[PDB]
């Protein structure tokens, strides 16, 4: 009852929910000192939908891991200098590189995390409305580069619902 | 009144306590990636040391900021490839560059953090007993590059207890 096409469709809500909950938890953290992105706060979302729950699961589990990459990603994205015009192709080639040596659920989540960091960086540097562009980078990569089919063979995004709760 | 010599002497317990309590809290982190360093787990400390208090406090209040640099320092130290043979040279170049454009308390604490990260690297690449060498790297640089004097003129290491 799952297909690659269905997984790709579902990915938009998964990613938008991931963005919402990741931003919310980082804005709530105590040390933080991180400027809010209002585009991520006012995302229209249905929290109890299944894809909403998947995005939340992936945002909240092990978030201490992505903290260890914060300063490096500031440096790297400053060197990348993403723009509205160059970001799709950079995203696609970075994602291809990421999965070259294999696909696993953690790398799938890392791709969502990169979408989040890229969206936040580009907003903070003055471009509004870019979240819709990054959302399609993520969906279209998964559709056209094996990831959506990989997820579909494993049951769809619902297979990620409980990752990290043993 | 507080001298640069007293600050230099105090710095050893500050740094050793800083290393112990930083390692303790980092090893408690969810998803921690660095393996445990038994030299820091079993590191003995003086129980009632005011300077021990200072090092503990600096480790604690620096945790949020310091961990955000973890992956970048892994990358950078893999590139530097420090060893026992070149550690003094590179520590001195790095510490000199750190303070070239000015001294401030955050940079003072970052020197401690660098000593910690260098000690971890060297142990994890196979060399035991190096913690005493880095400890002296830190103390000697502070004494001879006016950092101990700077701290002394602001009240000594206990002045750091007012941070945060």
């Amino acid at each position: 009852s799952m297909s690659e096409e269905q997984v790709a469709q579902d990915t938009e809500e998964v990613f938008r929910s991931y963005v919402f909950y990741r931003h919310q938890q980082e804005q709530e953290a105590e040390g933080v000192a991180a400027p809010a992105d209002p585009e991520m706060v006012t995302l229209p979302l249905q929290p109890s939908s299944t894809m909403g729950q998947v995005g939340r699961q992936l945002a909240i589990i092990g978030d201490d891991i992505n903290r260890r990459y914060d300063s490096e990603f500031q440096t790297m994205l400053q060197h990348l200098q993403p723009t509205a015009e160059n970001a799709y192709e950079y995203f696609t080639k970075i994602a291809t590189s990421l999965f070259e040596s294999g696909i696993n659920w953690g790398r799938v989540v890392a791709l969502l995390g990169f979408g989040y960091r890229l969206a936040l960086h580009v907003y903070q540097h003055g471009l509004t409305g870019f979240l819709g562009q990054v959302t399609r980078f993520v969906v279209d990569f998964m559709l056209h580069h094996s990831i959506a089919r990989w997820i579909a063979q494993r049951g769809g995004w619902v297979a990620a619902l409980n990752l990290g709760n043993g | 009144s507080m001298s640069e010599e007293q600050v230099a002497q105090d710095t050893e317990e500050v740094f050793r306590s800083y290393v112990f309590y930083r390692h303790q809290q980092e090893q408690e982190a969810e998803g921690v990636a660095a393996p445990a360093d038994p030299e820091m787990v079993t590191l003995p400390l003086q129980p009632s040391s005011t300077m021990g208090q200072v090092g503990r406090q600096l480790a604690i209040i620096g945790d949020d900021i310091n961990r955000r640099y973890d992956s970048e320092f892994q990358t950078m130290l893999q590139h530097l490839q420090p060893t026992a043979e070149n550690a003094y040279e590179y520590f001195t170049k790095i510490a000199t560059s750190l303070f070239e454009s000015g001294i401030n308390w955050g940079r003072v604490v970052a020197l401690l953090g660098f000593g910690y990260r260098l000690a971890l690297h060297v142990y994890q690449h196979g060399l035991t007993g190096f913690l005493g060498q880095v400890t002296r790297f830190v103390v000697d640089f502070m004494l001879h590059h006016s950092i101990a004097r700077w701290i002394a003129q602001r009240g000594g290491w206990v002045a750091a207890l007012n941070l945060g």
Binding site: - | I61, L98, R107
Partner: peptide, 26 residues
């Protein structure tokens, strides 16, 4: 290439300065 010790010192400085700005007096 920037020498590795220079890159490390630059990021040590950034880290320290972040601490310094966060834990400023009053």
């Amino acid at each position: 290439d920037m020498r590795p010790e220079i890159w490390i010192a630059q990021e040590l400085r950034r880290x320290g300065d972040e601490f310094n700005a966060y834990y400023a007096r009053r």
